[PDB]
Structure formats: C-alpha cells, structure tokens
Ligand binder design. Sequence first.
Ligand SMILES: [Mg+2]
Ligand SMILES: [Mg+2]
Lengths: 420, 420
Amino acid sequence: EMIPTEEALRIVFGVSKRLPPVIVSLYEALGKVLAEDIRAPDPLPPYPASVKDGYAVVASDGPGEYPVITESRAGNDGLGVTVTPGTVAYVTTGGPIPDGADAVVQVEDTKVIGDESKRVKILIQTKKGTDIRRVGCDIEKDATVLTTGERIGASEIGLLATAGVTMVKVYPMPIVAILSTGDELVEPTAGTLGRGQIRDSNRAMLVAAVMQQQCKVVDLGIVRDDRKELEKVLDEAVSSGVDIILTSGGVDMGDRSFVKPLLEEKGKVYFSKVLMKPGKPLTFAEIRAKPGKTVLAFGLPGNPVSCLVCFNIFVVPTIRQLAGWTSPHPLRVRLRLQEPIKSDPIRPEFHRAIIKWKDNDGSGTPGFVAESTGHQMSSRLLSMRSANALLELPATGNVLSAGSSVSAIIVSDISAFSID
Amino acid sequence: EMIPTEEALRIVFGVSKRLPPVIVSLYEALGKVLAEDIRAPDPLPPYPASVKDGYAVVASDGPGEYPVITESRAGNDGLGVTVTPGTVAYVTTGGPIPDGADAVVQVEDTKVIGDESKRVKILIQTKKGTDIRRVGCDIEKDATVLTTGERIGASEIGLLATAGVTMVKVYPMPIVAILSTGDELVEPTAGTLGRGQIRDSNRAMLVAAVMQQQCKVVDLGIVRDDRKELEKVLDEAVSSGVDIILTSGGVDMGDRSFVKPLLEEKGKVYFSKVLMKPGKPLTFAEIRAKPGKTVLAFGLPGNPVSCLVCFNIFVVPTIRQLAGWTSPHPLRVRLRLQEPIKSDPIRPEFHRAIIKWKDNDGSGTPGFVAESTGHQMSSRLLSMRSANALLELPATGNVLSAGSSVSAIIVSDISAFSID
Ligand SMILES: [Mg+2]
Ligand SMILES: [Mg+2]
C-alpha cells in the first residue's frame, strides 16, 4: 500500500501542470519565470562610449600638447564636432565619443596646460580603440538578453530595464487555499485552554510556508470533524479559483477523518500512503472545478512535523512546477554527520538537521556537516526549529556513526545559511 | 588609497547598528529576527493524548474481550469517566486519554465483537505508557520555545501559534532609499533613445535587489549631474526616516560627479576606494538625520555589474545587521572550476559564476562546481545573468586551471539552486 517517495513525487510531477502565463509590471515580474524571450530593441551602449574620464584622441597623434575642442558627458554634447588630428575632446565615463576620435586617454595620463583657451598634454602613446565601448559592446541590438523559462532575479530586472521592457509575460504563482481540521483545535489567539484543546499551529505554519514560496494564500480556517461541513468548505474552495488546496489532519485512521473520503468523492486520489517517516498518510488528489480548471489537493498529515515535512518535499516542487520552474526539485547535497543517528527499520526517514559549511568537515577537506535537531517524534515541532535540511536516511535500522556521509535535502534559502 | 575588502567590511560592520525593535503581528514576524524570548504558557500536549486511533486500556489487563465505556476524540469527551481494570475506551489520535487508562492499543491490534452494547477484543499484551503522549511530552509549560536573535521561518511561526503568541517583538527591516544619477539616463519606459542616452537600469535592479531582502523601498528617481539638485534629494532622503540610502554613479572621477563631495559635506565618509574588481570606487558614509537617527549611505559605482556586486558584498550584510541577524555574512563555500579563469594582477576579482552541486565535482567526490558567465567587463550586465556566486579570485594575474579550487560567495537563495 505504501508507495516509495520517488514514485509519489513522479505521480505529482506527471499530474501537475504549468499555469497559463500572464502579463505583469516590471516589479511584479521579480521572482517569476519568464514566459517569453526578451530582445534588446537597441544596442548597449547605443553610441560609442568612454570607459574613462579623460580625453578622446586620434591615437596616431601620440604624446603632445593639444587644444580641447569640445567636452562630452551625455546626450548631444559634441554633436557636429569632429576630433581631427591635432585636437582632443574631454570625455567623462559613459560620455559619447565625438566623431573622428578613435581612443580615450584616461585623465591620469594627461595634464592641463595654461591659464585661457583649453589645452591638455597627452602623456602616453595610446592604441586605437583603447577605453572605448563600441556600439553594442555589451548588448547587441536584437540580441536575446533573457529567455523563456528563465527565473527573474535582480540582474534580470536590470536587463529588462536596459531593454525598455516594463510589461513582462511570465508564469504566475499558484493561489493556495489552506484549512485545518479537528474538534480539538482552537485559534492561536486562545489563552487558557479547556480540557482536550490545543491551538491550531499547522494553519499558521502552512500560511507562512506558502508566503515563503511567494504565493497568494486563501485562509479557510478551522473545519470541524463533520463530513457535510468539510464538504461545503472543500466545494467552495474548489470553485473559488485557487490552484492548490492544503488540508491537514483527518486523512488517516479514525472514525471522524473525512478528508480522504471527500477527496475520493470529489476528484481522483492518486495515492494516500507513502513509505516515509514522517508523512506516511499523505494523500494527493486532482479535482476539476466546474466551468473549468484543475485543482490539486494535498491531504497533509495532522502531526505538525509530518505536515511541514510533506509540504517541503511535495508541495514546494508542485508550487514551482505550476510557476513554470524547469528545475523544481530541491537541492540535494552530500554531508557528514556530526553525531550518530539511528535510522528506521521500515520507512526511509527524513531526519531534521541544522547544516553548515565547514573548512574541515571532519575528513580534512571542506564540506557540509549536519547536527540533528534531537528527538524526531512527529508531534514535536521543536524538531523543525532552525532545521535547514532533511537527512535522507535509508530504511536499514542501523546506527549511522558520526563522520559517515548521507544525502540531505536543503529546505531553506541556502544563501541565508548561518556560517560556521 | 584602496583599502582591502575585508577592512572595508569591518568598517561597515563596526559602523552599522541594529535597529530598535518593534511589535508586529504573527504573519508580519515571518522573516524577521526575534527580539524577545518566547515561552510556552501551557504544555504541549496540555492533556495526556493518544498517538493512535485505537483503545485506551489498563496495560495489566492484557489480551481479552472488554466493554467500551466511552469514546474520546476531543475536548470534554470521556470527562468524569474512569477506565477501570476490565474496561477500555475508544480513542482517536490526539484524543484525551480517559482517567485510569495507562496505555493505548492501536486499532490494528484489536477487533470489534458483537451486534448491541459496544465490546472489543484486545489482541496483544501492551506496556504502560505505549502510544500516549504525556502532558508536556512535546513542549513543557514555561519552556523557552524560541530565543531572542532567532530568525522566524515557517516552523517558528508554528511554534508562536502553538504558544498562543500572535503579537511578536522583532527587529524590523531597514527602509532603503534608492536613486540613480546621470545626465545620460532616461527612464526604462523610454522607446527610441536619443543620441548619448541610455535607460536607467541600476535603479530598477537595486529596487529588485532590496525587495529580495524584504525591505521597504523609497524610489527617489533619476537625479541629474547638478550639485544643488542632488544635495536637495539627499537632504530630503536623510530627513525622510530611511535607514539606508543607495546612490549609483557620480562617485569616482569626472567633473560632474557630486555624490562623494556631498557625502563628505553632509556626513562622515569612512572610505571611497576599495581594492576590488569590480567595485573600486565604492563609498561608504554615515549621516545624522536632524532631530535624530543615523542614516547609512552607499555611493555605489555606476557601472551596472559594479553596482550589483557591491550591493551583494556590502549592502546585503548591512541590511541583515540592521535587521538583527547574528550571522549576516554571506555563505562562502569551496568549489572546483569547470573552465580556466584568468585572475587580475592588481585587484582581487569577484568573478561571476553559475554554480551547481555535482555527484562528481571532477575529483571523484561530490561537490560544487562553477562555470563563468563569460566576459567580466563591468559594463556588461549579462555577466550577472543567472549568476548565483562570486568567485573570490586572488590578485595573482595567473590563469587558474579547470579543476582547481577557489572560494566562492553564494549570492542567491541556495535552496532555489537548479540541480545538476
Ligand atoms: Mg483530527
Ligand atoms: Mg554619471
């Protein structure tokens, strides 16, 4: 009954489809994947431009004293002026090279002479083309500067701005609906708890996890253990326009667990048991919204750790696939254990760790190392605290010694890792 | 005159100060650093809770047929009912254990008997405490679940919700003002460019870079090469409440470069020349806003590459330090070059690369590898395209062969790295 994680992931990958592209403004494009190629409408620079503050010269003149016939910093400066042999022009970095000049001698290789007509001493012999950016040096006209499937970061925004593109065709992020289930739950605003009550922590945790993925959230609240109630919430969520529904709890054993029977009634359940610790009751379904698009549903396990681990392993790549990422899979690295860890005898375990890069990983060479977050019980959300990786432990039941190597899934921005 | 990058960074670190903490809502706390410890007001679970769907029993009774005297799923279910020797109670996962029961036998190790009073056959001999979470098992009452200086991610939001904390004391992000300088610039909305004009790309690039750091941006636009004009913009920016001002251009040589003289007049310039390629004219200053707080100013170089490299190396750790990060420094790793690279003979170079983790880094062991983004000229923003690292090349002027190892600064979320 329990399918391997690799199979469950292949099923999710084959079912999930990229969202239709949209047109957004320049700053709305940040973080999104391009759905069109971007072409430069003009060259960069669009005019021969100086690399230095100095003088535009005729290289063959060589060292000597010359009159300064114009000054060129921007725009129309020096328009219609020709730098002929025996003359020079002052230029600032980025200034347009006047017609006739063929090199720039930086100001450090010159000296101003006299005082009232402007004259300069060129102190070196330069070569044609020195310290000039030719037209199209950096970007040629009609070059493809960005391509469909490329994710937009800060330099890509810079390239869009360079090319004068301020309305961009991209793949959008999915809209995600989230609900919690359970008669024992109370809102996280609750003070004193009554007997048999706990605060709903999964919903806020998932809202935050989805916010970190840059998706709009639809918070559907706490749903009680009543089939008709959950049916109504799920039906309205499916017809609301969301792309993904996340539930937690009420998906495994127990006589008031209605998520799985409702997903089986409303859509197609691809799996409901995965060979993994934590996360074995994870349920994945596809529901058709009536005209009419597809909605993906993840029936996440109720235990807090299980809920977040399943989100990290299955929901994150699904969000990325819907958002057009060509490489949605998580970064996996190899690392060395800083302490001994016992694997499970039946299920491959995703053991929470805090990893860091060290100059010596224990073997004399630089590498990542990992520390366990401690007890791994699925009810213990403190085992996720500060965890930036999931160690992929095989189902051997053996104690993996300190210094041994394992594969690890990196789950939090690797560029925000705390240094050793 | 050119100070080493390590010295420039130490100066910035010593001058930069953590911002005063504020109180925010639960979801506004995501991404922020805690400025208080968080204590659990009650235990998790706050009642003895079942780990399984099954029956709460007296362990010493052993296998046998017993009447089901109550059912417990949440809240007050089973309140006042005592499970005595010779009786059992049905329980769902998370349900409160009735008084008198001391173990749970999961439903798979039982069978329902008869049909009309409820009776069950317990098929195993269990042990006291099996499949029960004692009060405080996961979190003890008054335990510190989160500490001052801890960054809040999704699991931390979950822990805040668990503890009923929905108003959180955190360090805020800095507010950042951004402007571009130059008579040659036009807005990125411009179509056909006139002679000697280019689109302003640095400002949008920096707005995006600051957005990626989760800071509010104040966009001050294009400023022309006029001392009084820039003075007015800088003066108003300083008194606006921002914490950081970023300029680009007009900071090195040239007779219409007013950023450096204005920073020297209005505040204290700590350095204006750094021994690095690109980025050597980087200028750093502290300005006092009149009552009255300190404002940090970075006079970034005008060349697009230089502008973003300096942002990545100097501004990012400054943002993080202001936002209370205890480890603001960028992740540095060791990696192997996939192609030969020529270092500079005078300045240590921050060479743009696209890095990835490989199962074989070329030496037979897993590791990061790097490819150059190509020509590294500072006017060529295409050299930043897709770059996720800066290779730290020493100032040797030698060709570093393919297969050699270098240090690299990771500049983009390592958990969003495209896999090999
Ligand atoms: Mg439940
Ligand atoms: Mg300028």
